[PDB]
Amino acid sequence: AQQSTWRDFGRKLRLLSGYLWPRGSPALQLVVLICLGLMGLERALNVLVPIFYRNIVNLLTEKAPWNSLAWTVTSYVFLKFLQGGGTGSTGFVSNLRTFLWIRVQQFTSRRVELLIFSHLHELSLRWHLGRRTGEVLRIADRGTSSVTGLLSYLVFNVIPTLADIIIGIIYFSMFFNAWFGLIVFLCMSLYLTLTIVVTEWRTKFRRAMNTQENATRARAVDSLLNFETVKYYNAESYEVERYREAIIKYQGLEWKSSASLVLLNQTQNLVIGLGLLAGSLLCAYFVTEQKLQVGDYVLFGTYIIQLYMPLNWFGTYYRMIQTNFIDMENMFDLLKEETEVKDLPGAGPLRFQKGRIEFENVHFSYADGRETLQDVSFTVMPGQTLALVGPSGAGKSTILRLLFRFYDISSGCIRIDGQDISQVTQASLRSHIGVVPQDTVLFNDTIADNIRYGRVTAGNDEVEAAAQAAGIHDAIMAFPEGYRTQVGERGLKLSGGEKQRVAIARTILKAPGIILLDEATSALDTSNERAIQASLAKVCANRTTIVVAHRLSTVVNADQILVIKDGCIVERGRHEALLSRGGVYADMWQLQQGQEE
Amino acid sequence: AQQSTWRDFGRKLRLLSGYLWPRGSPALQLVVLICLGLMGLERALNVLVPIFYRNIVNLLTEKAPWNSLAWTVTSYVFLKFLQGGGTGSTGFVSNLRTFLWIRVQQFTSRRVELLIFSHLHELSLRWHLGRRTGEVLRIADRGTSSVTGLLSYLVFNVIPTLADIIIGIIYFSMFFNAWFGLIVFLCMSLYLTLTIVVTEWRTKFRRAMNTQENATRARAVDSLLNFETVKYYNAESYEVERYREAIIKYQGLEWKSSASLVLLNQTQNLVIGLGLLAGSLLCAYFVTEQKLQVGDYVLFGTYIIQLYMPLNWFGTYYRMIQTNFIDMENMFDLLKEETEVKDLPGAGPLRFQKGRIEFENVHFSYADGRETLQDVSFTVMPGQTLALVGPSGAGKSTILRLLFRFYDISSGCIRIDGQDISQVTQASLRSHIGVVPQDTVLFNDTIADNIRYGRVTAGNDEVEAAAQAAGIHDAIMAFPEGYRTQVGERGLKLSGGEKQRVAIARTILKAPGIILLDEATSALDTSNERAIQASLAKVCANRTTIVVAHRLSTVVNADQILVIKDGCIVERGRHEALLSRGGVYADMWQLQQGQEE
């Protein structure tokens, strides 16, 4: 229950990383089994090959014919080839183990990254505005690389290194005289303690260096963005002198940081030299003079400096483990709770005998932000043109946003045909109704598979039926590549109303039950819209149509309109009556006829 | 004369990097001398210490008392401590050499970076058009780090490594039998050739991996910025399937890249193993059986794998040398030619008996861009209010920049008092006249040393004389820290006209001869300006004043105005006459009196 690094670490491993591989089950567990087998084989070879080095030295000092030497030295060169030298040539089986490990690394990275990317298509848009999304994608894929590097380094470069230390200290404690193992243990404990102490002494100097670095960069960048000001008042020498003393003090701080780093290197060198100074325990100390051989010296001198080379790399792991742990908690905690979605059981899709919609007393405020609807209730028969054309506040878009189930509002629930919307599922509502946006964004793809996006699986009718029904067969046959023009925004800007008519073509390829015009054009001239409205309102048919606008040449229904004020209806009138009797829309009509010239 | 990497490289070293250190001349050449001495000492120790290893092995196989062994093995541990192990512990004298080298590294980095930063305060914005300065500052400090890393790596990690190779091959060619040196030379030539061939084979795979990486990132980021479009039309599975196959083909390309990298590691391992396979030339090959000792084997087995460990690091140097060379040519060529400045000899500062200014037929166009002045000539007596208040084109703001000597214009040079401006120096003109900008930018500093820039070494009359003469002593005594409020833009936004009145306070602390009131407020209400204009025009005194505006409640001089049209005067009139006779300013006055309500 405490805030530490084993309660959450033990909670996230309760069979969560246990079904990590349920896809390639015949031929993926064999890969990790062969990787563990090669890891154990390499840990065995690291102890096995200096024994053969000692055998070569003992056979040279105790002279033998060439048949007892040639196969021995070729087998030694072979067994050293299987484990490489030191850092150089990285061994024969370790890099092969990484070449086999890269496939399951790609598999687990693909799994966790698709899990994140599939999680970020639920959890609603109310939370869809943190302030940015490039930063959350950057911490997302840094977190995926972080968790795969963390698991790889923790299972490959910490635990096998410690196992090599344990098998070496068992070797020195059992097989020479149980005297060298005390030296190895004290030297390695002193090495690790001095390394972590000078590392935690160095981190604050590095942080001060970074703060002085971005301070002395921010002192210069604003001085050079003010070029006109520095060409004024002829004071360039003062600014270059101040930047001179700023970079002087920055060089002083990073000189302190470099002094800390070379002191770390000096302490590691002093510890490894004092540990290697016990090579004088190979002469006249009941060693090598009475009861040991010649190769027992070179075995020590090879194996001690052999097992100390992975201990150099404790630098640039510890900070990497810290950054990987903070990236793991950032990707684990700050991404996955819930926002709004209620897919409760016992839910039929929808009921669609007609196209009615019904409203009863909606009440919502934007989390005590922008004021919005109150006391709105009306009933629309199947097949009707309805306008929401009041002043440009929040209640206009409010009608457009709410029927699509972005968020719940009040105890009262909306009733489309015969069932409330809080009980039924999401996908039937998102499929049976279809809106027309204010502006259409084409993806970086062709024009033909931007019209495809609603239906799916083309079917070879989108250039034949949808392009002709929108009246755009000429312009889809007026492309240099025929119709496959592979630009959405990285090439030519297409037009203003062309994006709206291709959104209407997408709506035709959706075939909705209730269409919600949502601010039809709002960007270009009305002379194109009033000319091509016979094809724009072809999708306007025997179905419920709800349109919002402010250029009121489109609203010519003359049946009933619902001019809104501050999210509150006070008239619930109609077009001829709001031009005649209840003038609020009439005053807007006077100022609009004054606006037309 | 050819475009290659030695003509310019030999031209930039003709005594340019020869006076690199003329500041710390008593105690900075000793530092680089001790660094070269320690480099030579470490190159000597790398050959010296395996000789003592051979002596230890020969004395152990040819048994001696402990007095002939103990000092020998302690001296060997000492001499190995002075040069470290392999990569581990980095030696005793090399890291000390870098600790002494970091000071002269800071010195040369400070020199070249202050040279760049002092060069970028000269010439004319006839370059101050490069639509980006963050990138040129980024390329600038990357170039400084580039050139210091290039010089350090070239003098420390290439030439001493080659000297170690030469002294080793002289050792093998002179001291064993002149047979092992052929093996070492052939092995190292084969190693370097295979390394550079597989490196140039791998670079194109890395470039293809980077192109597929940013392609598959750009395919996802625009899909997720269109979250409303993907919540529309319920087609999330299609986008995640397309992103699935995109990251599949990206993983295939980077699998090819990783295969190339592990093939490079395999080729290096094969070459070092085939070179080490000549350790079978230490048995029955006129070696170690008739005329050599036991330590001659371990000398070979230590020194061959000793001198091959710097040869591993040819990777991640060659690409670094390429990036450092392209950064060096980017910082060397694309920064320093000239723009405009003419500081020719034979130039008096200025002549300042009065405050006259005189104009004769200016003609300029913005490099065939925006059309500007033609046929403008007039004469202003010392002490006069003059307006340039035509339509908002390019001819209004032409004069302030032009009189301040930003650029030459035509054969007609301007004559301020008795001398043309193309002959005299820059600093006297930039000091004797002072302008008032449209908007004032406060630096990230206190308020008191933002007023202090004009005088230099203000001492403490700026809060007493300048703050009282501008009438701002109350607001400079109304701060929580008294007056030292350490925010310019990172804290509170101060006000609109407060920046203009503190610019007027800076102008008072400049004490100009001719003031150019360039677009006084242009952002806030006129009721503050017309109330505090008695302190705004306190600097308006017995001196030449030139003001530009469009809110014409300020221009009340009624002496002579110079309303401009398309950079051309056709009236050269006055206020009462342009309201009475030559109506162009009168038509502007009619539409402005129609604009006031």
Curated annotation (Swiss-Prot), chains A, B:
Statement: the UniProt record of this protein carries the keyword Transmembrane helix: yes
Induction: Up-regulated by cellular porphyrins (at protein level). Up-regulated during erythroid differentiation (at protein level). Induced by sodium arsenite in a dose-dependent manner.
Enzyme Commission number(s) of this protein: 7.6.2.5
Tissue specificity note: Widely expressed. High expression is detected in the retinal epithelium. Expressed in mature erythrocytes.
Effect of substituting N542Q: Does not affect N-glycosylation. Does not affect N-glycosylation. Does not affect trafficking from endoplasmic reticulum
Lumenal face of the membrane: 52-58, 164, 288-296
GO BP: brain development; cellular detoxification of cadmium ion; heme metabolic process; heme transmembrane transport; heme transport; intracellular copper ion homeostasis; intracellular iron ion homeostasis; melanosome assembly
Keywords annotated in UniProt: ATP-binding, Cell membrane, Disease variant, Disulfide bond, Dyskeratosis congenita, Endoplasmic reticulum, Endosome, Glycoprotein, Golgi apparatus, Lysosome, Membrane, Microphthalmia, Mitochondrion, Mitochondrion outer membrane, Nucleotide-binding, Secreted, Translocase, Transmembrane, Transmembrane helix, Transport
Catalytic activity annotation: heme b(in) + ATP + H2O = heme b(out) + ADP + phosphate + H(+); coproporphyrin III(in) + ATP + H2O = coproporphyrin III(out) + ADP + phosphate + H(+); pheophorbide a(in) + ATP + H2O = pheophorbide a(out) + ADP + phosphate + H(+); coproporphyrinogen III(in) + ATP + H2O = coproporphyrinogen III(out) + ADP + phosphate + H(+)
Activity-regulation annotation: ATPase activity is inhibited by MgATP with an IC(50) of 1.03 mM and up-regulated by coporphyrin III> hemin > protoporphyrin IX. ATPase activity for hemin is up-regulated by glutathione. The ATPase activity is impaired by increasing copper concentrations (0-300 uM). The ATPase activity is stimulated in presence of glutathione for increasing copper concentrations (0-300 uM).
Ranges for domain ABC transporter: 357-591
Stretches in topological domain Cytoplasmic: 80-142, 186-266, 318-597
Membrane-spanning parts: 31-51, 59-79, 143-163, 165-185, 267-287, 297-317
Effect of W313F: Does not affect substrate-stimulate ATPase activity
All copies of domain ABC transmembrane type-1, residue ranges: 32-323
Chain's role: ATP-dependent transporter that catalyzes the transport of a broad-spectrum of porphyrins from the cytoplasm to the extracellular space through the plasma membrane or into the vesicle lumen. May also function as an ATP-dependent importer of porphyrins from the cytoplasm into the mitochondria, in turn may participate in the de novo heme biosynthesis regulation and in the coordination of heme and iron homeostasis during phenylhydrazine stress. May also play a key role in the early steps of melanogenesis producing PMEL amyloid fibrils.
Family of the protein in this entry: Belongs to the ABC transporter superfamily. ABCB family. Heavy Metal importer (TC 3.A.1.210) subfamily.
Protein name in UniProt: ATP-binding cassette sub-family B member 6
High-level lineage: Eukaryota, Metazoa, Chordata, Craniata, Vertebrata
Gene designation per UniProt: ABCB6
Segment of the intact protein contained: 234 to 830 of 842
